[PDB]
Swiss-Prot record, chains A, B:
Protein name (Swiss-Prot/TrEMBL): RNA-directed RNA polymerase nsp12
Active site: S93, D94, D95
Swiss-Prot/TrEMBL cofactor(s): Mg(2+)
Regulation: Inhibited by Remdesivir antiviral drug (GS-5734) through non-obligate RNA chain termination.
Renumbered residue ranges of the record's region RdRp Palm C-ter: 14-133
Complexes and interactors: Interacts with nsp7 and nsp8 to form the replication-transcription complex (RTC): nsp12, nsp7, two subunits of nsp8, and up to two subunits of nsp13. Interacts with nsp9.
Catalysed reaction, written as an equation: RNA(n) + a ribonucleoside 5'-triphosphate = RNA(n+1) + diphosphate; a 5'-end diphospho-ribonucleoside in mRNA + GTP + H(+) = a 5'-end (5'-triphosphoguanosine)-ribonucleoside in mRNA + diphosphate
All residue ranges annotated as the RdRp catalytic domain in the record: 1-108
Function according to Swiss-Prot or TrEMBL: RNA-directed RNA polymerase that catalyzes the transcription of viral genomic and subgenomic RNAs. Acts in complex with nsp7 and nsp8 to transcribe both the minus and positive strands of genomic RNA. The kinase-like NiRAN domain of NSP12 attaches one or more nucleotides to the amino terminus of NSP9, forming a covalent RNA-protein intermediate that serves as transcription/replication primer.
Length: 133, 133
């Protein structure tokens, strides 16, 4: 990087002015959202779940995450459909709006703010203060 | 009581030879069964209940037991119907057989053996050993 009049070494992170900033930011945003939903669903107690289909989902999700080794298209499909029904999203580059079920969220079947805070902490190295959400 | 050749004083309990033994025993049996069901339903945590109608039942049961003061025919009716659907009984004098839901029992919405043991302990002054149930 030619800051000032000398060359330094950029450690990491994006350089906002390249050929594809807004789109890669959108991709990264969706990634964090999905990661938070996954952590939310996996970090909840199973016995407290009422619906049989939802346990089935959580059980087989743990399967497809750690036990399995390669892709399983049908699981991905039905989970993506589940997310599209309980967590609709609107994404412009790093700027999101979420319309989500409220009782599911209360029970812990989708992600609320706290999950985003935890995810950002251990995967982004920042602390998202709750005065901005 | 003219045992031996002298008169003593009977402290309590039935004299199994009067004019109406088997029927009064049947009544007392049904009483203990209903008491056990009531203790079972009231001694269970509310938040763990899944169905809304059942939390309504438990809530209003506590109402009609302690908060209220006189009878409420509709509550009695619908609770009696509830029992007739998830507890079905066959009573000869002090000798019963029960055909009951199993998953409700597991969750704690009807009475299992343990509730009978507790009820007999504090309301009959005996310890019902589980080798006879």
């Amino acid at each position: 990087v030619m800051c000032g009049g000398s060359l330094y070494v950029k450690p990491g992170g994006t350089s906002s002015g390249d050929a594809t900033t807004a789109y890669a930011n959108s991709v990264f945003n969706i990634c964090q959202a999905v990661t938070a939903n996954v952590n939310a669903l996996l970090s909840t107690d199973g016995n407290k779940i009422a619906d049989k289909y939802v346990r089935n989902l959580q059980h087989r999700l743990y399967e497809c995450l750690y036990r399995n080794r390669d892709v399983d298209t049908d699981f991905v499909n039905e989970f993506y459909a589940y997310l599209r029904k309980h967590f609709s999203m609107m994404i412009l580059s790093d700027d999101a709006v979420v319309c989500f079920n409220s009782t599911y969220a209360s029970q812990g079947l989708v992600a609320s703010i706290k999950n985003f805070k935890s995810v950002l902490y251990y995967q982004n190295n920042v602390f998202m203060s709750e005065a901005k959400c």
